Design a protein around this motif. Structure first.
Motif, PDB file in Angstrom:
ATOM      1  N   UNK G   5      57.077  55.321 146.856  1.00  0.00           N
ATOM      2  CA  UNK G   5      56.940  55.902 145.311  1.00  0.00           C
ATOM      3  C   UNK G   5      57.694  54.878 144.578  1.00  0.00           C
ATOM      4  N   UNK G  24      48.391  55.209 142.064  1.00  0.00           N
ATOM      5  CA  UNK G  24      47.511  55.686 142.655  1.00  0.00           C
ATOM      6  C   UNK G  24      47.012  55.804 143.575  1.00  0.00           C
ATOM      7  N   UNK G  27      49.082  54.085 146.747  1.00  0.00           N
ATOM      8  CA  UNK G  27      49.298  54.950 147.340  1.00  0.00           C
ATOM      9  C   UNK G  27      48.768  55.633 148.417  1.00  0.00           C
ATOM     10  N   UNK G  28      47.507  56.306 148.268  1.00  0.00           N
ATOM     11  CA  UNK G  28      46.934  56.611 148.925  1.00  0.00           C
ATOM     12  C   UNK G  28      46.342  55.975 150.139  1.00  0.00           C
ATOM     13  N   UNK G  31      49.970  56.544 152.262  1.00  0.00           N
ATOM     14  CA  UNK G  31      49.832  58.140 152.334  1.00  0.00           C
ATOM     15  C   UNK G  31      48.940  58.149 153.713  1.00  0.00           C
ATOM     16  N   UNK G  35      50.377  58.291 159.793  1.00  0.00           N
ATOM     17  CA  UNK G  35      51.812  58.403 160.951  1.00  0.00           C
ATOM     18  C   UNK G  35      51.336  57.552 162.191  1.00  0.00           C
ATOM     19  N   UNK G  38      54.468  56.623 161.005  1.00  0.00           N
ATOM     20  CA  UNK G  38      55.747  57.451 162.501  1.00  0.00           C
ATOM     21  C   UNK G  38      55.656  57.037 163.427  1.00  0.00           C
ATOM     22  N   UNK G  98      60.650  52.973 158.214  1.00  0.00           N
ATOM     23  CA  UNK G  98      60.328  54.643 157.477  1.00  0.00           C
ATOM     24  C   UNK G  98      59.967  54.375 155.253  1.00  0.00           C
TER      25      UNK G  98
END
Ligand SMILES: *CCC1=C(C)C(=O)N[C@H]1Cc1[nH]c(/C=C2\N=C(C[C@H]3NC(=O)C(CC)=C3C)C(C)=C2CCC(=O)O)c(CCC(=O)O)c1C
Ligand SMILES: *[C@@H](C)C1=C(C)C(=O)N[C@H]1Cc1[nH]c(/C=C2\N=C(C[C@H]3NC(=O)C(CC)=C3C)C(C)=C2CCC(=O)O)c(CCC(=O)O)c1C
Ligand SMILES: *[C@@H](C)C1=C(C)C(=O)N[C@H]1Cc1[nH]c(/C=C2\N=C(C[C@H]3NC(=O)C(CC)=C3C)C(C)=C2CCC(=O)O)c(CCC(=O)O)c1C
Ligand SMILES: *[C@@H](C)[C@H]1/C(=C/C2=NC(=C\c3[nH]c(C[C@H]4NC(=O)C(C=C)=C4C)c(C)c3CCC(=O)O)/C(CCC(=O)O)=C2C)NC(=O)[C@@H]1C
Ligand SMILES: *[C@@H](C)[C@H]1/C(=C/C2=NC(=C\c3[nH]c(C[C@H]4NC(=O)C(C=C)=C4C)c(C)c3CCC(=O)O)/C(CCC(=O)O)=C2C)NC(=O)[C@@H]1C
Ligand SMILES: C=CC1=C(C)[C@@H](Cc2[nH]c(/C=C3N=C(/C=C4\NC(=O)[C@H](C)[C@H]4CC)C(C)=C\3CCC(=O)O)c(CCC(=O)O)c2C)NC1=O
Ligand SMILES: C=CC1=C(C)[C@@H](Cc2[nH]c(/C=C3N=C(/C=C4\NC(=O)[C@H](C)[C@H]4CC)C(C)=C\3CCC(=O)O)c(CCC(=O)O)c2C)NC1=O
Ligand SMILES: C=CC1=C(C)[C@@H](Cc2[nH]c(/C=C3N=C(/C=C4\NC(=O)[C@H](C)[C@H]4CC)C(C)=C\3CCC(=O)O)c(CCC(=O)O)c2C)NC1=O
Ligand SMILES: C=CC1=C(C)[C@@H](Cc2[nH]c(/C=C3N=C(/C=C4\NC(=O)[C@H](C)[C@H]4CC)C(C)=C\3CCC(=O)O)c(CCC(=O)O)c2C)NC1=O
Ligand SMILES: C=CC1=C(C)[C@@H](Cc2[nH]c(/C=C3N=C(/C=C4\NC(=O)[C@H](C)[C@H]4CC)C(C)=C\3CCC(=O)O)c(CCC(=O)O)c2C)NC1=O
Ligand SMILES: C=CC1=C(C)[C@@H](Cc2[nH]c(/C=C3N=C(/C=C4\NC(=O)[C@H](C)[C@H]4CC)C(C)=C\3CCC(=O)O)c(CCC(=O)O)c2C)NC1=O
Ligand SMILES: C=CC1=C(C)[C@@H](Cc2[nH]c(/C=C3N=C(/C=C4\NC(=O)[C@H](C)[C@H]4CC)C(C)=C\3CCC(=O)O)c(CCC(=O)O)c2C)NC1=O
Ligand SMILES: CCC1=C(C)/C(=C\C2=NC(=C\c3[nH]c(CC4NC(=O)C(C)=C4CC)c(C)c3CCC(=O)O)/C(CCC(=O)O)=C2C)NC1=O
Ligand SMILES: CCC1=C(C)[C@@H](CC2=N/C(=C\c3[nH]c(C[C@@H]4NC(=O)C(C)=C4CC)c(C)c3CCC(=O)O)C(CCC(=O)O)=C2C)NC1=O
Lengths: 177, 164, 245, 164, 164, 164, 177, 99
Positions: G5, G24, G27-28, G31, G35, G38, G98
């Motif tokens: 970001x 963006x 960035x999509x 995002x 997971x 994650x 992360x």
């Protein structure tokens, strides 16, 4: 420094057992509540500056002996220390709202303030008045019944949470006295 | 305790700021991962006894020399004590599982455990045999939901990787 | 006329006072290592102040909504005042920081070699040890009338030990510009009340620890150590001389 | 920048720990609130020109005395500066809005703005008139989605509550 | 208070010396400037009422928008507050003028004034219009002695240069 | 060096302020006492040779055992040294007298003189006999002006009260 | 400390304009990935103790001159330091996982590390060897192809993320040399 | 310890009269146990639950309050004592409590 979770955990640790279904159910009421708390803290922390200004200004408005010479609001020094004290209080109150338990408010702010104001000759009644005005103005913003700024939110009931926030302010106002 | 909301409130307190949208998104993730994690806490409070029993039984099934008469656990009271210690461990996994994060588990169980366990001639490999026994006996669909099970895995692994 | 045309070498006084300059062009390397090395010591002791992960009461760093940035401005100016020193102050600081680092090393040969070896680490070791242990002057808390009194007297005698002359030194430096003073006053009061809100367990080991600094810096004397046994805030009041103040 | 993942990272780095499941839930909330405020970011990059124009025009519609010849904004270049200043501000609301948190907006625009604005005799009430004008001219369903709009409101309010 | 004799005795006290001839020369400067400055303090206690009245009247003569119903001073009680506040300022100029130095005027008026005035939406430019009005209405030989007048100018300018 | 200007400047630098009127009155006292001090400095530069000669001769007039062959001053070269030490002192009285304050006299002559004098078996009472001889041989109106003479007195007393 | 970001924001700030749909969109992708990152960080941070132990033990296995007298691993003190160095390296690598950007890894660990090891006489080739072994072990855990521990995850495609983590390890191993 | 800003070098230090400080806890304990002993013997003066004849504390319409003013002033006179009377009181009260 302990939220609702850590409060349930600590109480079950003093009870020495597992959390169990019952405590998790009350915790599901917390989690299931959720974004009402989120939006509530957004409301208070949004208009926080304005709350602080109004509350202290109102406190000076009810008794002008504060700004009278020999009052504790008589100078720029003491007035600025007064304003930062109102601001810090509202800061820890917002912390207490995201937390769900007053642990952060008890440990980080409440712990040692009374002795200190007594030693500095801060009038405690006037402080409890300041806390009371920040309470009323904060509940009026948190219920969205503020007559100046009224923003759109999807409706529902958030009264119990208002009672929680009023409990925190009453804890501070009961502690300063 | 170390948790989401205590890390964010601790960071806002250390910074001296009002709690902005960053802490709000953090507690958003807390209230979203909570449903999955708590369920695992419910089932842990369900069958902790058989967890401890299979854990300790398999622990001495691997290490038999402990009930020999040198090594510590050679009496019925100390096999009771060992079982209770594993019961404290699973209770701390339940506590930290309810809280979110490793805070209850770190500050009650891990902090200062090296001096105690090194003092009282206590091998960590016995504990790790117990926890890895539970982690291998976990399964996938039958008792739990898979997602919540991952949470359980994480906590148990953290204990192993805080032990040795 | 200097031989160099570009990036003509300008070693800093600290670099020259120290042994860093040399044949291999080490001066880039050693000075860089000290900077990296110093931050390692500090991060270690900041890891010791917060084991659990959340920032303690020690690290709040500002109550007013813009006072944090004020602390950032003040920290850099204080380093700038540290850089404006004369020759003798620099050699005095490197030797006293050296001996105090060795006296805190508690006889570890390896560490002693690495305190003589690098000037920068030793000094940040002293400061960061005394902050992590909670044993030096900021973390003093009087607990009688006589502790408060003798910290006033002891404090005054320390400031007379530091400036025998009437001329104020660079170290007091309370303000840089206008309005600095009141803000430093605000944060300084917030530090003391902040210390009031420490956990009970820490304050006890801070007391013991300030006594241990009292026995070290006082000396092997029955009088002074008798007084430190009477009142433990005096051991916090034993600043080093490598501070001015 | 102050953000979710930088706060968690700082917390873990200051402590000296591995990032446990707590930071994972924090970044989970980042990745779940993201879509909304990124939509609001897209729209702000859509019509920023008209935003700055209506902002400054309503700002001098309220305070006329600035273009009188005492007060600062009384020359064409400084009215250009006023519009330019508001353009900075909206672009920082876009940046902070994309990041998540108040980080771009705090560390570029807010930090030490008191000295600048109080030094150069720049009154805050004009800026607050601009921002409150934009926040009151906002909208519920017509331009934006409501939820994202809330995020926009937050960031703009933060600017106001960092001004006076 | 910050003053001549307090600076010197403070320096001697911090140092732990006897007050030598240097401090005696400092208090020599005090006893030499004193009468001219005190005279100015006598005349300020003479005509402070008219000073405050012309100060505030010229202050709203410049800034009309304050009595408009946005900006703060739009009620009779707050114009009274504005007048009384100036009266405090002239009293502080009298006090610092008597003392010698900027001591009482700094610690009672200037210290922490930024937070208060920035908080309660108070413009500094109104104050500065008042003080510069009094500084321009000062004259030369007719009311005061010239030398003492310079001292008055100094004190008043200090207030201005501590405001913006 | 400790001086009126240095004291005020140090106070302003340590405080971080522009030099206000307090320092201005301090340096006013400096510039007013200056002529009396300078005159005394002119006369001291006038007759320092005979001052040193009478000083040391009266010093050994009191203490004869110094030219005995234990104690230090027992050869013509070391009596040359005793004279030189007194000559340094009169010259430092001249320096500090011109400066204003005790700065050069303290930092050149007095600071760490205890270790030197006590190291090299030097009695201070011999110096004190010399200085008090000069101070008693001084005069009111015959050599100097009275007021400036007082300045001289002060500085010489300082030496004595910095010695024992 | 800059994530994905803040890297987009800094690039747009050097460009001095607004954000825009292209950045963006990337960035999509970040995002929308989510997971996977994650669960990946959960995998490496889970088995962190094993990787540090195995990799450093392997590093001692390829050349026994380290444990030979005169080597930098010859004592318990020096071995302890090495173990903590490998651990801190893997810690900052996980931070960079992360974050999505290597800014935390460049600022907090990498900035002056080569000079430090040269000043201390740490053999740099041995460090790059250890970083290489942690690279391969960490990619094997991150793809869940580790031969000892294989935990259940819902399958998908994780190769690009493995390429990211290998890029971070190659950044560290390129930096220490 | 009065909580008054004392200076030690760089920053003022506040004096602890709360929480962990032991003297404060002891002082609080004495007051609490003193009132405890009083309320126990007041429980022995009125066992039935009706207030006795001794506790009338007056007759006039404002005399109660007078007694309240007198009691506070008597505590104040207890506090204005010299050194030797206080140590003498502590020792004689101690041996009479022992007896
Ligand atoms: C700018 C801050 C602000 C916004 C925005 C807003 O909507 N209203 C204020 C905060 C606010 N204030 C109250 C409550 C009271 N405020 C006062 C102070 C004023 N009343 C006066 O008579 C005067 C002097 C003329 C002032 C400055 C008082 C007395 C109250 C009521 C106190 C009580 O006991 O209830 C509130 C809550 C009411 C509401 O607006 O819903 C808020 C949000
Ligand atoms: C550094 C250790 C110092 C030495 C040595 C010394 O002699 N004094 C220190 C530096 C110093 N400070 C001032 C001026 C002020 N210092 C202030 C801060 C304190 N005042 C407070 O109320 C508190 C909190 C309880 C603190 C920490 C303030 C305020 C002033 C006055 C500001 C002003 O506007 O004048 C000075 C100058 C005064 C003097 O000592 O001569 C010096 C040298
Ligand atoms: C830690 C206990 C480990 C578990 C659990 C596991 O499944 N495997 C361990 C971690 C692991 N190690 C690698 C990769 C390599 N490990 C090496 C070291 C060993 N090789 C040797 O020859 C010796 C000395 C006899 C030792 C100690 C080496 C070399 C590699 C390969 C390096 C390379 O460049 O690829 C891996 C990844 C491979 C895998 O098991 O999938 C893992 C997970
Ligand atoms: C499936 C992939 C496995 C399989 C799983 C089995 N587990 C069995 C019994 C059993 N498992 C546990 C541990 C488990 N129960 C819990 O509640 C929790 C955590 C909260 C865990 C980790 C216990 C305590 C028990 C005994 C009680 C019971 O029967 O449910 C089990 C039954 C027979 C057996 O012991 O194996 C099975 C089949 N076993 C498999 O072979 C596959 C690989
Ligand atoms: C002379 C160089 C000027 C001149 C001066 C005038 N001032 C007049 C009136 C007036 N001035 C003041 C301010 C003054 N009085 C004080 O006591 C102090 C400070 C202690 C100040 C700064 C006041 C309050 C008043 C009204 C009361 C009075 O009349 O004395 C004045 C009279 C007419 C007028 O208002 O101008 C004069 C002439 N005016 C000049 O044009 C030259 C340049
Ligand atoms: C990250 C920031 C963040 C926030 C600021 C909140 C914002 C938020 N609030 C609600 C949702 C809501 N918010 C409120 C709040 C209230 N309604 C009232 O009439 C009162 C005025 C007020 C008291 C606080 C209510 C009542 C709901 C709907 C009920 C509910 O969802 O529980 C929702 C549900 C989704 C939706 O409505 O589209 C969200 C996301 N959540 C977040 O994640
Ligand atoms: C809150 C968490 C928590 C724990 C996890 C335990 C951990 C723990 N165990 C012991 C103490 C002990 N723990 C064991 C257990 C062992 N017996 C063996 O054969 C095995 C190696 C092992 C079981 C697997 C024994 C035998 C003792 C007593 C040791 C001794 O006295 O020799 C002690 C010291 C106090 C005591 O004697 O009880 C502590 C702190 N206690 C806690 O408060
Ligand atoms: C850049 C250079 C550099 C150094 C030289 C070290 C120096 C150093 N050592 C320790 C810390 C330590 N150092 C030792 C070492 C000792 N154990 C003993 O038995 C002996 C007396 C001695 C080895 C000879 C120990 C045991 C600790 C931990 C002390 C404790 O926590 O009680 C700390 C505090 C932070 C930490 O806990 O790691 C620091 C700064 N660190 C650096 O950054
Ligand atoms: C209020 C409390 C309080 C104290 C506790 C003292 C502490 C103290 N001692 C000294 C100063 C001193 N203290 C000692 C004492 C020592 N001699 C030795 O052989 C032993 C190691 C040790 C006695 C056990 C000495 C010798 C000095 C002078 C040191 C010197 O000038 O070299 C100084 C510097 C000022 C001075 O020279 O007096 C101070 C502040 N002062 C105080 O105001
Ligand atoms: C010791 C010195 C000293 C001062 C100098 C004043 C400064 C001062 N003024 C106000 C407060 C105030 N001051 C004014 C004055 C103004 N009205 C306007 O139209 C003008 C801009 C301006 C006069 C020129 C007003 C209106 C208030 C009240 C503001 C409000 O409540 O909105 C306050 C807050 C407390 C209060 O409400 O009284 C303080 C500290 N007070 C002091 O103790
Ligand atoms: C800047 C100021 C300044 C001073 C004031 C002197 C002070 C001074 N005197 C001596 C040194 C000396 N001073 C004397 C003087 C004495 N002989 C006696 O019979 C009398 C007691 C006494 C004269 C009144 C002697 C004899 C020595 C040499 C002592 C020796 O070597 O034994 C020394 C040591 C260095 C040297 O040998 O010269 C110093 C620092 N020096 C300075 O730089
Ligand atoms: C709060 C903690 C937290 C986590 C730990 C993750 C856990 C997580 N992973 C996935 C989902 C997934 N996780 C992986 C990961 C991989 N699969 C492979 O085969 C590789 C071994 C590995 C590389 C990292 C994949 C591929 C998916 C499915 C694809 C996807 O959803 O993008 C999902 C989607 C829902 C579901 O599957 O039921 C969730 C919640 N998310 C969280 O919120
Ligand atoms: C009591 C220990 C001690 C300290 C703290 C000291 C110096 C000192 N550190 C100070 C400040 C200071 N030092 C720290 C570092 C620190 N605090 C901690 O709790 C830990 C564990 C730290 C790192 C070792 C902080 C957070 C601050 C506050 C923020 C700031 O002011 O920058 C100050 C105050 C004014 C200044 O900045 O100089 C002073 C005077 N000298 C000491 O002996
Ligand atoms: C060069 C002179 C200088 C300094 C000194 C720092 C001081 C500093 N710390 C900050 C803020 C700050 N400081 C810490 C505490 C700190 N971080 C940790 O992770 C641990 C373990 C800590 C104690 C050892 C935290 C936790 C924050 C909040 C930001 C963050 O998330 O890290 C901020 C931001 C203030 C604000 O937000 O307004 C500043 C200015 N900055 C400077 O420019």
């Amino acid at each position: 420094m302990l939220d609702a979770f850590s409060r349930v955990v600590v109480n079950s640790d003093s009870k020495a057992a597992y959390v169990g279904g019952s405590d998790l159910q009350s915790l599901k009421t917390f989690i299931s509540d959720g974004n009402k708390r989120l939006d509530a803290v957004n409301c208070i922390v949004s208009n926080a500056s304005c709350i602080v200004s109004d509350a202290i200004s109102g406190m000076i408005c009810e008794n002008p002996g504060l700004i009278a010479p020999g009052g504790n609001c008589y100078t720029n020094r003491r007035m600025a220390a007064c304003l930062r004290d109102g601001e810090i209080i509202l800061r820890y109150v917002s912390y207490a709202l995201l937390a769900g338990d007053s642990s952060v408010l008890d440990d980080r702010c409440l712990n040692g303030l009374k002795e200190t104001y007594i030693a500095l000759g801060v009038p405690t009644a006037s402080t409890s008045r300041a806390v009371s005005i920040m309470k009323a103005a904060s509940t009026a913003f948190i219920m969205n019944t503020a007559s100046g700024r009224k923003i759109e939110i999807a409706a529902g009931d958030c009264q119990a949470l208002q009672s929680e926030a009023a409990a925190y302010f009453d804890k501070v106002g009961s502690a300063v006295d | 305790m170390k948790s989401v909301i205590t890390t964010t409130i601790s960071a806002a307190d250390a910074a001296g700021r009002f709690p902005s949208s960053s802490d709000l998104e953090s507690i958003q993730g807390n209230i979203q991962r909570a449903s999955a994690r708590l369920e695992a806490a419910e089932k842990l409070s369900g069958n902790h006894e058989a967890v401890v029993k299979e854990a300790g039984d398999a622990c001495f099934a691997k290490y038999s020399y402990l009930k020999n008469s040198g090594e510590a656990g050679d009496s019925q009271e100390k096999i009771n004590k060992c079982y209770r210690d594993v019961d404290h461990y699973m209770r701390l996994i339940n506590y930290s599982l309810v809280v979110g994060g490793t805070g209850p588990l770190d500050e009650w169980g891990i902090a200062g455990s090296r001096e105690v366990y090194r003092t009282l001639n206590l091998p960590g490999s016995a504990y790790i045999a117990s926890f890895t026994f539970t982690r291998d006996r976990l399964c996938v669909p039958r008792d739990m939901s898979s997602q919540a099970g991952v949470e359980f895995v994480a906590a148990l692994d953290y204990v192993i990787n805080s032990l040795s | 006329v200097l031989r160099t045309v570009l990036r003509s070498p300008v070693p800093s006084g600290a670099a020259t006072v120290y042994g860093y300059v040399g044949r291999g062009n080490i001066s880039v390397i050693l000075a860089k290592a000290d900077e990296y090395m110093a931050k390692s010591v500090r991060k270690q002791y900041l890891a010791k102040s917060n084991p659990y992960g959340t920032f303690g009461v020690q690290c709040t760093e500002g109550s007013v909504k813009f006072a944090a940035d004020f602390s950032r401005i003040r920290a850099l100016n204080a380093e700038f005042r540290a850089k404006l020193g004369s020759a003798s102050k620099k050699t005095f600081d490197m030797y006293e920081n050296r001996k105090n680092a060795i006296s805190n090393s508690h006889g570890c040969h390896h560490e002693e070699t690495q305190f003589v070896g690098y000037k920068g680490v030793s000094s940040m070791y002293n400061v960061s040890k005394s902050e992590a242990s909670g044993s030096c002057s900021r973390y003093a808390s009087p607990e009688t009338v006589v502790e408060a009194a003798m910290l006033r007297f002891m404090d005054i005698q320390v400031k007379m030990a530091a400036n025998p002359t009437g001329v104020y030194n660079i170290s007091c430096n309370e303000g840089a510009a206008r309005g600095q003073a009141e803000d430093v006053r605000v944060a300084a009061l917030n530090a003391a009340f902040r210390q009031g809100q420490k956990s009970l367990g820490k304050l006890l080991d801070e007391k013991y620890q300030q006594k241990k600094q009292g026995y070290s810096f006082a000396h092997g004397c029955n009088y002074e150590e008798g007084l430190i046994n009477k009142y433990p805030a005096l051991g916090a009041a034993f600043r080093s001389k490598s501070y001015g103040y």
